[PDB]
Amino acid sequence: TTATIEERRAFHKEVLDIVQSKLANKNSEWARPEEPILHNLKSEKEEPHVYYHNNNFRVTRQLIHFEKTKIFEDELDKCMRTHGEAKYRKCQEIAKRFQASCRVASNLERGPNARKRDVGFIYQNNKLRELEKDAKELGLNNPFPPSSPRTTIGY
């Protein structure tokens, strides 16, 4: 994928038009965008308007994710408190969903140096499954535990 200077300047002109259309009507939610500005730029920093708008969209999304995770945690805690000793069987699904939400929130914007948050040990379990499959098929002896059905309340 290569971007010619003609295409780059064309996109720049289109971006300016998008800014002009946004400027025409006042919006109190200008910095809480519901949709990103789609682009094929090598670096987002090239188009400043796209960079700022998309950053504001990403912040909005992350805030929403954090609140969704809090909601998921509240339903998991209520479910756990209602069932009693049947919590392990009945709250597997809610827990699975909560852990998925935690991963989505943490992983989306972890940062340049941060590792992926393995909520539920899904990645570790997957790695152990691959290692087992390889050892068994190649006749090797695995020095690691075999993959587990359940490693956490959900995942």
Partner: protein
């Protein structure tokens, strides 16, 4: 040594103070002095008890509003007399009460 003029304002040694023990009476501490026993203590303690009961009332109101019982008690609990959010008791067999 002739006691300084301000020494008249300061309090005497309390009954609980050992006679040999000497302490500087000018030093102020929020927790009280070396042996305390102030005059008017009975009133202060009554005021304290009233503030304690009022705060207990406020705490009770707050707790009752925030106490969430999501699983039915096995039998009757005292909370039913004061809180209406208690689920109807179900016994070990499963029969509702």
């Amino acid at each position: 040594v002739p006691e300084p003029p301000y020494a008249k304002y300061l309090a005497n040694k309390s009954h609980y103070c050992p006679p040999d023990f000497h302490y500087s009476r000018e030093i102020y501490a929020p927790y009280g002095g070396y042996f305390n026993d102030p005059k008017g203590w009975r009133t202060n303690t009554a005021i304290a008890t009233l503030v304690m009961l009022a705060g207990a009332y406020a705490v009770f109101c707050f707790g009752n509003a925030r106490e969430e019982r999501l699983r039915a008690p096995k039998g009757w609990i005292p909370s039913q007399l004061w809180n209406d959010n208690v689920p109807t008791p179900v016994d070990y067999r499963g029969k509702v009460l």
